[PDB]
Amino acid sequence: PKKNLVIVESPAKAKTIEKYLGRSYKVVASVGHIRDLKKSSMSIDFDNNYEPQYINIRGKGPLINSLKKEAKNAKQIFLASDPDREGEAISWHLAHILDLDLKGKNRVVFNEITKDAVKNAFVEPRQIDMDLVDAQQARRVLDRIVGYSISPILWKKVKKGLSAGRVQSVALKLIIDRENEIKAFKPEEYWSIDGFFKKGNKKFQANFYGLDNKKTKLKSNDDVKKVLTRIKNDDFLVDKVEKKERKRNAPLPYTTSSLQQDAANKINFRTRKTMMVAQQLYEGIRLGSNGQQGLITYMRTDSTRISPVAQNDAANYITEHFGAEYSKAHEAIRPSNVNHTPESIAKYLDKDQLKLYTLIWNRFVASQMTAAVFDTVKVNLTQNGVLFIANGSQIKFKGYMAVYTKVLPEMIKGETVKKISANPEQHFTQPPARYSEASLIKTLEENGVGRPSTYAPTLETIQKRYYVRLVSKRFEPTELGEIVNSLIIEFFPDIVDVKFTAEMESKLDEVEIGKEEWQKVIDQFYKPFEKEVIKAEE
Ligand SMILES: [Mg+2]
Ligand SMILES: [Mg+2]
Ligand SMILES: [Mg+2]
Ligand SMILES: [Mg+2]
Ligand SMILES: [Mg+2]
Ligand SMILES: [Mg+2]
């Protein structure tokens, strides 16, 4: 009786998958990477087109030996690593250590850890995708060449122990450019006027807009006076009434970027914690006697697609719980089972897992719902050329907002309302906001620089390196970060450059699809970079 071997990256994953598979399957964790570049040397074969020189990781020897013994005992080997570039290179390193044939169909991929998703994966296993593997290799070779080339230069000109990276340097320069804008900003005093009116004895508020049919900027207390003195009596003509219905569509389901943004904005999660907790949700949590189950789809994704089956089950949850009026190869981040309401499984989750799951559940359900609808009214109240604007809003259909506004007294053109009081208020303009974790992520996504694997580590290493601090939830450059940024701008300008770095990520994308040869991406980077390293070592 010889079993099937299934290798996974973590024990929590193996425990979860173990129940799903049954007798003729043995499930073991490799506990992270087992092969890596050498730590004590560059570990790139520059005579053989940048081929990485890998070793078995220092310390993992005994683990590796036991994997080899289990593989000998096994009937067939299945590599069940996560479905991304990194998971494919893990599977390739295991193939290498276990002497498996790369033409064999030993790779099984799934994007949630549920009994149904797991078993469908073994129905059609595939061979290892060497394009995905080469895309991981390229990133690893790039980051190694950059890190081990620049770091000694920082040690020479700044301080021992320093390091830099590609996307980390882009982010740091973006933060320093924003700080330069802040320093150069010139605040200005300006004033507003709140008005309080009545139609009948129904009170409401309208804000000063301007004089003589233009918007008016009030720069001082004297400008407020000039408005005030134009106001003779309390009578205001309803010069116009505007009405509309406003449709607020539903957000898309979470990607890695939008999950990280929402978690940081809404529940004060640092991005590292968001990914840590998502991983717990994903790899499997004990739901009591029903044992461990994966509660969300895989959390590293840039897809917003929902699968047909997942779509149908949510429509049914929505139709049944709100009304059918609220409905309509990778995937977004969603509950694996929508019927696992946050309320139901609350008792099985710690507080942090409860928050992130609640966030992911709400967002995915909302995203499967219909638009909210509002009833707008804009009302112009004019006297003697002075214009106040009243605004009113109420919801005509909650729509997706089901999972989570004042109205105006009635008016038509020509009626009259009475002015009770006006409240001038002093303000000062503010500079552009600092990057929060949210807006940094959003910026890195929109400008083409970030990817699901690189969002959280970039914001981690920039803080581990002490190049920025994070106060009142926004990044500020440190003095050391300014020093390092200036050196790299001086000697390696392209690695702070947004466009060159988004270009590189797109070339990595092409490697993944087999459109470009990974060694060529490295060579087009390395040939110019090499010259800059020589000149910086002068
Ligand atoms: Mg070894
Ligand atoms: Mg990668
Ligand atoms: Mg990178
Ligand atoms: Mg590396
Ligand atoms: Mg800044
Ligand atoms: Mg991550």
Side-chain angles (χ1 to χ4, degrees):
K2 256 180 20 182
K3 306 199 277 175
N4 279 126
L5 187 68
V6 164
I7 314 189
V8 122
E9 310 100 298
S10 75
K13 240 180 113 181
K15 280 207 94 82
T16 299
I17 285 163
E18 201 159 36
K19 54 173 294 197
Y20 292 161
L21 284 196
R23 209 94 197 150
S24 54
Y25 289 96
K26 161 78 153 290
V27 185
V28 288
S30 61
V31 198
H33 262 274
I34 54 157
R35 277 171 101 220
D36 195 28
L37 303 182
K38 309 180 229 131
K39 193 62 200 159
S40 40
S41 80
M42 178 67 86
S43 211
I44 298 314
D45 193 337
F46 282 107
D47 297 314
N48 183 35
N49 309 303
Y50 312 101
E51 186 74 8
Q53 306 162 344
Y54 295 112
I55 49 147
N56 300 356
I57 284 166
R58 293 96 157 193
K60 307 283 295 261
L63 181 270
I64 284 185
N65 189 257
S66 161
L67 281 184
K68 291 177 157 201
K69 286 191 205 264
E70 298 276 351
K72 279 177 214 134
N73 176 321
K75 190 205 331 159
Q76 200 185 348
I77 316 273
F78 289 122
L79 311 166
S81 324
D82 290 341
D84 60 17
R85 300 192 190 166
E86 209 218 339
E88 198 81 6
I90 301 264
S91 293
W92 177 69
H93 284 299
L94 297 156
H96 183 277
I97 286 326
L98 302 181
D99 312 287
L100 303 175
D101 197 298
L102 297 175
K103 302 227 114 174
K105 278 159 62 181
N106 34 48
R107 176 88 171 100
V108 303
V109 292
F110 40 96
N111 60 20
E112 59 207 313
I113 307 187
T114 64
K115 195 191 266 179
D116 270 3
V118 161
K119 286 177 111 290
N120 292 25
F122 294 78
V123 160
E124 43 177 58
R126 56 171 179 80
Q127 38 158 51
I128 282 169
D129 183 347
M130 290 301 293
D131 297 326
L132 266 180
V133 169
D134 284 355
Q136 197 268 357
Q137 295 204 278
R139 184 186 297 290
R140 196 85 210 293
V141 168
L142 270 183
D143 292 346
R144 163 56 57 100
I145 284 178
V146 171
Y148 281 25
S149 293
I150 281 165
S151 298
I153 291 151
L154 303 181
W155 302 343
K156 182 252 260 194
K157 316 171 174 282
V158 184
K159 191 217 315 185
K160 290 196 244 329
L162 299 183
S163 44
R166 295 181 325 109
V167 178
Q168 172 264 298
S169 292
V170 173
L172 179 54
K173 169 161 196 305
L174 285 169
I175 286 156
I176 287 172
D177 291 338
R178 169 65 39 85
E179 194 71 16
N180 290 343
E181 303 191 320
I182 285 159
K183 292 182 187 172
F185 177 82
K186 307 282 179 204
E188 295 171 295
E189 176 177 356
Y190 67 95
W191 292 66
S192 59
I193 306 167
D194 291 339
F196 275 74
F197 299 74
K198 63 194 263 263
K199 165 81 188 166
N201 293 337
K202 311 188 126 98
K203 300 193 171 139
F204 71 97
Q205 181 204 4
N207 303 315
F208 172 77
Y209 189 83
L211 301 172
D212 305 319
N213 304 293
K214 52 179 139 211
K215 199 177 166 42
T216 299
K217 109 175 277 207
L218 304 175
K219 303 153 276 288
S220 73
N221 194 52
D222 291 12
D223 296 348
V224 172
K225 298 293 160 263
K226 294 164 137 186
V227 178
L228 291 191
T229 199
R230 295 272 294 266
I231 292 168
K232 302 308 182 186
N233 46 78
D234 303 321
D235 280 326
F236 272 77
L237 167 79
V238 179
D239 168 75
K240 214 184 91 216
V241 163
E242 180 159 350
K243 300 213 180 198
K244 288 149 127 287
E245 91 184 352
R246 163 210 185 179
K247 286 171 190 300
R248 183 145 91 202
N249 273 325
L252 285 149
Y254 282 137
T255 75
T256 295
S257 164
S258 53
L259 174 63
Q260 282 184 23
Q261 291 181 60
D262 258 34
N265 290 337
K266 300 183 177 303
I267 65 184
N268 202 46
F269 272 24
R270 294 179 176 263
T271 42
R272 178 180 198 287
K273 190 194 201 175
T274 295
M275 294 300 100
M276 188 284 273
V277 168
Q279 205 170 73
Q280 291 167 2
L281 289 180
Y282 163 76
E283 295 188 341
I285 306 290
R286 200 149 82 194
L287 295 190
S289 311
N290 312 357
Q292 296 208 1
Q293 313 184 37
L295 308 178
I296 62 170
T297 48
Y298 183 52
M299 63 273 158
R300 299 195 173 83
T301 181
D302 62 10
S303 166
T304 47
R305 155 190 179 248
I306 307 285
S307 71
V309 162
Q311 298 190 44
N312 291 313
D313 215 17
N316 288 325
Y317 187 92
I318 288 156
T319 293
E320 142 191 51
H321 276 93
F322 295 115
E325 28 187 3
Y326 293 69
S327 169
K328 304 285 84 151
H330 281 301
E331 257 188 289
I333 314 188
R334 60 164 165 81
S336 48
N337 182 0
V338 76
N339 292 278
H340 283 327
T341 77
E343 177 199 321
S344 65
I345 68 186
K347 70 168 79 52
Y348 311 106
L349 308 173
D350 76 19
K351 60 168 198 302
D352 287 340
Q353 305 165 334
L354 186 39
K355 286 196 209 100
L356 201 67
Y357 185 79
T358 293
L359 261 193
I360 293 166
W361 193 91
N362 287 340
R363 177 96 158 209
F364 160 76
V365 167
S367 85
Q368 302 306 284
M369 312 213 259
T370 42
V373 158
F374 294 80
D375 273 328
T376 189
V377 164
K378 192 179 163 258
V379 162
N380 299 30
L381 313 168
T382 65
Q383 169 198 138
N384 191 38
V386 180
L387 168 62
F388 284 73
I389 306 289
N391 268 281
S393 165
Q394 58 144 77
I395 315 91
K396 231 180 59 165
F397 185 29
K398 289 244 201 105
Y400 79 85
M401 313 182 46
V403 290
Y404 315 107
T405 48
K406 280 242 264 179
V407 202
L408 291 173
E410 189 55 17
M411 282 155 212
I412 51 96
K413 180 170 201 178
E415 308 179 346
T416 287
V417 316
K418 290 276 173 206
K419 200 219 88 201
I420 288 76
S421 45
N423 289 332
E425 187 178 349
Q426 183 189 56
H427 313 260
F428 301 88
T429 54
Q430 290 182 19
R434 290 194 173 87
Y435 289 107
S436 67
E437 303 172 278
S439 66
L440 191 52
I441 291 327
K442 183 170 147 233
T443 295
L444 294 172
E445 167 179 19
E446 287 170 355
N447 63 18
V449 163
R451 288 298 185 279
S453 53
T454 62
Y455 289 132
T458 300
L459 276 55
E460 190 179 337
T461 67
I462 200 168
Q463 294 177 81
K464 290 172 62 88
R465 293 187 167 139
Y466 304 146
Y467 294 160
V468 303
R469 45 172 189 276
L470 185 61
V471 317
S472 81
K473 291 171 58 90
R474 317 218 169 234
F475 288 108
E476 299 187 34
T478 71
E479 285 187 345
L480 168 64
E482 297 257 15
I483 302 289
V484 174
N485 178 58
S486 282
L487 249 65
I488 284 158
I489 276 161
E490 179 182 3
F491 298 101
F492 308 100
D494 287 313
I495 72 140
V496 309
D497 189 80
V498 164
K499 212 185 86 179
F500 171 100
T501 301
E503 249 172 54
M504 185 86 76
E505 295 298 325
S506 289
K507 290 167 164 203
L508 293 189
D509 288 354
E510 274 164 17
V511 167
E512 183 194 292
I513 282 317
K515 287 274 171 311
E516 178 65 270
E517 285 61 73
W518 81 268
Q519 300 95 335
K520 284 206 229 150
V521 182
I522 304 301
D523 194 65
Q524 292 158 24
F525 164 85
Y526 188 69
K527 294 285 167 191
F529 186 79
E530 192 189 17
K531 307 184 212 129
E532 304 173 309
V533 176
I534 284 143
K535 289 175 133 182
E537 289 182 328
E538 273 204 284

